[PDB]
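Example 4.3 (complexes with small molecules)
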Amino acid sequence: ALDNSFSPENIAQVQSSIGDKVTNIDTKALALNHQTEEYHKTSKLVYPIRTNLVVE
Amino acid sequence: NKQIEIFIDGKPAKVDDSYTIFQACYENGVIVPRFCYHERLSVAGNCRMCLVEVENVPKPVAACASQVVPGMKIKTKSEKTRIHRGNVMEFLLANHPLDCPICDQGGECDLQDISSVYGYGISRYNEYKRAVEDKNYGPLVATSMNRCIHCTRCVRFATQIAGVEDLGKTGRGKAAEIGTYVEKTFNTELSGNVVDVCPVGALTNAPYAFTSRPWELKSFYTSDVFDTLGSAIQVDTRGPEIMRVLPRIHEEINEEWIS
Amino acid sequence: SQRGRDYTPSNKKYLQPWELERKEYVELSLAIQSAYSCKMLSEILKDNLYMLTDYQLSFAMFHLWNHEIPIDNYFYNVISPILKEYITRFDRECNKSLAEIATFLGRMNVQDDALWKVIETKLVQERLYRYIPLNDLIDLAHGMATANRGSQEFYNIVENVIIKHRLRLIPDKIAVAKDCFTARKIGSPLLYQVLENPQAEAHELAGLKEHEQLKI
Amino acid sequence: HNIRYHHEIHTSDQTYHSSYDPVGETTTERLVRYGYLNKDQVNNAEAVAAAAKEFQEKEKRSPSNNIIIDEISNSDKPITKENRESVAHHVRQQFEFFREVNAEEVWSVSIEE
Amino acid sequence: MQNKYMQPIQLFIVFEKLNSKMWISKKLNSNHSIALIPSNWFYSINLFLKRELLFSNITLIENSAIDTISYNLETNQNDLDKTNIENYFFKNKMLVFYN
Amino acid sequence: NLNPYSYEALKENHWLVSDSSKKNSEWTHKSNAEQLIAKVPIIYVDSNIVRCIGGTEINAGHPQVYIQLDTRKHGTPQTCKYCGLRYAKKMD
Amino acid sequence: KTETYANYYYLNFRSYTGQHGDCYDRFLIRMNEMCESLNIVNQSINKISKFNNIVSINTKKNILNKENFNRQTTVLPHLVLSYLNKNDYNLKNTKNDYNSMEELITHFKYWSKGLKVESGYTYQSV
Amino acid sequence: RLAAHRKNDDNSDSVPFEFTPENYKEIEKILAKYPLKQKRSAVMPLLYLVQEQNNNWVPLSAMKKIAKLLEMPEIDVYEVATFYTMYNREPVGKFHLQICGTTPCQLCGSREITKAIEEYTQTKLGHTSADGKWTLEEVECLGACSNAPMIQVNNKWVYEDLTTENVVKLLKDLESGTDKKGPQNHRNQVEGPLGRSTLKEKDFLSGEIRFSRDFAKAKQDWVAQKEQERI
Amino acid sequence: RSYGNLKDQDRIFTNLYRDGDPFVKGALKRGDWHQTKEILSNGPEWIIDEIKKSGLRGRGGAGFLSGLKYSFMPKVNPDGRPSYLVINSDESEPGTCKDREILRNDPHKLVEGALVVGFSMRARAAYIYIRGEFWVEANILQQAIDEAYAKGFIGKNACGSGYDFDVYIHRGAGAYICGEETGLIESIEGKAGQPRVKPPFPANAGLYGCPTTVTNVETVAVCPTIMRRGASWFASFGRPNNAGTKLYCISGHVNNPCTVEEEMSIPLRELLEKHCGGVRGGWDNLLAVIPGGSSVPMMPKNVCDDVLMDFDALKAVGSGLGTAAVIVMDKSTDPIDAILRLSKFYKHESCGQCTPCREGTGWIVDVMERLLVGNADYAEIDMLQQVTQQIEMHTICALGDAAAWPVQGLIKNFREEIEDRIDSYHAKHPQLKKSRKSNPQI
Ligand SMILES: Cc1cc2nc3c(=O)[nH]c(=O)nc-3n(C[C@H](O)[C@H](O)[C@H](O)COP(=O)(O)O)c2cc1C
Ligand code: SF4
Ligand code: SF4
Ligand code: SF4
Ligand code: FES
Ligand code: FES
Ligand SMILES: [Zn+2]
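Answer. The structure with iron/sulfur cluster bound is encoded below.
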């Protein structure tokens, strides 16, 4: 709901008000990422791309 | 003295010696962007959108504030005039709140009209905008001081047209308040003219607030029966429902103001 | 287009894209991008001399580098004079164009003594390298090293700037700069340590205070 | 930070209009149509000269010149029915223009192909 | 417009009775010219175009009418010229354009 | 608590009759979004001017709007003109 | 030349014309058009492709990056526009209607009344 | 600060504001400066008197009374009050300390002096102290740019030559109420330190500076020159 | 010649060092109220001619012809409308203190000058608009005015010459905008000091609708002394078109800040070294010099080495004489900080009557704040220069153009230092992705 420009306690209170427990609402991390311009979270596909079989 | 001769964009034109440059332009069908000068209100240099480049002149001259000089050549279509108008528009757009989707002026705002026509095209002031809280003046005048450009239109109209003295410029710098000093309502039997006088979405019809946009209103010109004068008006409607009414320019009945 | 129009630049030093019709600029860019012969490119540039642009010249150089188009006697005779005139017409707002031209000429191993002298004078005497990005400066140095056409003064200035911009070194640009330096064997122990770890603290890096004592 | 040149200054909006009076219209007929020569006051040398002078001075064009406007090409040679040599020149110009236009094709026209 | 272009004045030369009015603009291509013609010598013009060398190799591309009764210049009214298709349409009631 | 259509109520809720239960709006607007947003608390802000976009990034919410937290009366919160969030002064 | 619209004026493509004007001729025209369209599409894709990369002076191994879309994909759809129209490219990539009031006015006008068009009659064929 | 009247009960309409008889008597001379047709031209003297006699805080009731006296709109009176920075619409501290923050003051070290003063009072520059004795503010160029650094107290008796120890001593004196107005150093008012190179000769300063001129002869010469130019 | 050395013999402001009583006693000791009736008997035409022949240039902002400005006043109003003579003793421009020194040291000379100006313009009334910051100066001036009125030089009978002269002292406020002419007239009328339309001529329509002529305090001060001495005496103290002396006020990073009177066209280096002991740390340590008010752009070291304190010389150097306020900044001052402070002062001084001026001042303040930290680019300098150019000549008064000139001068002079600071900030802070949101609030 709120951007990085918001205060840490206010951000946590807003996250708790909407009953949010899935998104990261840590006050320490919110203070550490104050006014950040990271691109996004990224995943890494690891070669080779093969089907994950359940064989026993 | 009786018929001076000017050159508007290289076109010779015989005009009156007492008329303004904006008067000559409007008479010759030349549309000049403007935001403060009203033909029925006091002439002021509050806006700079009328600053026009004239041949053999050092700086742009407010056409609404500047009269016609004999033999003057006004190059309204010149690149210098275009650059000056763009600079003025960019300066004006510096602190205008991004409220067009949430302002009743959308679709009929002289601000956006000048921006699309006489504007630069893009914005370059990447900083936090100043903000001023709106006022409370009753259910007739809807106040949005954030978009109030301090055009002094409300003050001039109240002092000169309505005659009431409740509007004035408070403060200085970039935080001048376009509103009353104390908290009160504006009840002077011409509150509907305050919304029609604000060049921006600062003053709007609260009963008609968020009703619709001009793109969905059908206007028909008629005459009122509520007052014994029967001043001409235009009623805008949407389908079977009548939306609102606005004054019509009738100098023989009520000029351009209604009760 | 040209009828009732003057192709004279407004700035009297370089013609910006705002002075010409967009259709003409687009057509010139497409023609430059579709020039598959050295003689054809020379003819296109000469014919479009009245409306030529620095961005268009940079794009032509980039296309010549990407397509590996051979530089022939036509390039040495016709392209060289126009390129020299454009370089003499450059300015501080021509940082991207000048850097791209230098990098492309170096990467393509272009052998033009007069053009190289003009480029060196513009880069060093005018000291416009401050408007060249650190990664862009490293790429330009790598290009100059590819043809081995570069001044040792510019190399030292580039090394000092690289030492200055230790926090902005990406791994790819770092590897490119390391190749550029080791290929020409031009560098310092401080530059080599920065190549080993650019974002490292001031303890591991030796001579950092002395290097920072001299600005730029 | 360069917001001055977002709006294009030059656009391909140039328009030219070329006006030519009737080719068969005689110089005396042209003066009569323009009002410089009276319909009845014809075949008089002095009146014809006066009408021609008035047409030349007022309209800034020769009464024997059929080109009113030539903004498309700015040509000066009018084509008149009396001007057989000018008609021949126009025919030659049309043939040369046809040849040049058909010779400017990249893939449309190819004699060798 | 860097190609060879010339007004088809041969139409008025053959007609020898119609005041030719031609217009060329950069809004259309470099080979597009628009001319007003009287309806009286309309079939004659069509036949002359259909059966004349340097013009017989022609094909009708399109044909459309414009209800010039209510076509009115919305904006930039003062910018109208004295040789404008807009003024010509404002003068007449309909305009049939055959390309 | 105060009866609707009163002068005090009109002065308070900008000449409008505020609905406390929010069911009147949930029927008139066909959505309980009014009460859902009313479930939010009041936020105290240190700065006298705030930038609200209804989200986390530009174009990730509503257009940025500047709200003046410093008014004539201390501690008067302001709801966003773009989102349902309301912000107030940190102390006064 | 007087009718080329977007990109055929500078690219080489082969067009086939029939010598009979029959149904088989039309079918052959369609098939050859499909083949030449595939070829022209490949050429156009290559025109916006970065076929060359900086090669190391030491030895000749290409200096391939490790964290670059260029290393991942040889095609750069933004390279030409970024190099030739960097001002417009930056203006578009930086400012938005959610951030620029002028851009907000542009979005409003384009979505409510639309951009005004000058009076005139034109005919464009594709 | 706030261009609109803040919702403070201290400046509410219920505040009792009546001008003193001396202020009423003083109004006789002030009104004579401007024509009777324009009595609003005395609004500046009226506001000055109000600020003098109302603890450097102009009440809204005082503004209303001034508007009643001036026969001018109350909105106009409020606008005139807010347009100027020399008027305080709210109750300020006993010492409205003003420090010049302009470049001429900052070059002489106005920032260090302000920091020392704030350390003395333990109050922010933009706020007022809890004790209610002083209120700091970074004022603009007070006309003492040449004698910078310069401070002022209650818009009168501006002090100059503001050093660290000098400012500490001046603040202690202000607490004691006996401070050397103007510069607290050896500079002779505008004659700054390091000597005096202007008018070092004093005999001519005491020479009665009597310059005579026979204006009738000069006027006759001017008229004769005009006649000659005409001829 | 080699100007810049004027002795005490021809000095008008003899009590500049506060060497005498500013009251009527020291005034008559300083030559005040001497031959005033005879000088007035020459007539308004003769007085105006003498002022013009003295080569008097406007001592305030512009340096325009004071004689021409005074002669532009109407001889007689056909409708009986009065006349007003305004003396602008409200100098809020940073760097200047000459008016502040004059008010507290030479009170009656300005009174005699205002009386002479009113006689020349047939004005029955004069208003000395004294700065609200000059409180004690205003009190001293009021005492001197009362003494002069009791002396018979002003009032119903001004020195017994059959010309009633009334004088008022206006205690203003902190309004550099009211420091202007039209803003001063507006504040005198009892409203906000926003400048009026231009040209509405104040000579054609000034204060209270009556014609009003506004002049600087220093310009009006020399009116009686110059008339007594002769036009040649004040016209042989400077270069052509720059006639008269000037009370240059020098401060900043100088060794001995002060304010002294000297002949016009004084060499910059000579006047700096002789009158103040040079720049603290010598001529080598000096980095910049503003030769006028905050409006005047800062000058470079080479220009300061080779320049003269004249209007034409300053214009040739790109600066302006203006108020002749000599602000000296040494090598230890960050020019960006001074620019930001001047921006804050000017934006707190623009009346905002012009949206262009107000918005430009705010954006320039924001850009100055962002530039010091380095969170900007080289293109930001170009954008700031473009904004400053756009603000110029497009405002109501000269205030909107005043703030842009210092920024333009700083940009033209200190490109390398700003670039180095930006480089340091950027190498100290790398960020590939720039946030699409506006600049973070300061
Ligand atoms: C914002 C602003 C401030 C001004 N401040 C002063 C000032 O302090 N002193 C002054 O003499 N003129 C000042 N002026 C100039 C006046 O408007 C007026 O032109 C001038 O006082 C005329 O005096 P002069 O002809 O002797 O220079 C200022 C102008 C502006 C626009
Ligand atoms: S007044 Fe309203 S509609 Fe007009 S530009 Fe401002 S925010 Fe947009
Ligand atoms: S509120 Fe509106 S009418 Fe009043 S001054 Fe502001 S812009 Fe003008
Ligand atoms: S220039 Fe500035 S101070 Fe002067 S009138 Fe205009 S907005 Fe006000
Ligand atoms: S609208 Fe014309 S000067 Fe203001
Ligand atoms: S800057 Fe210090 S009082 Fe002027
Ligand atoms: Zn929101």
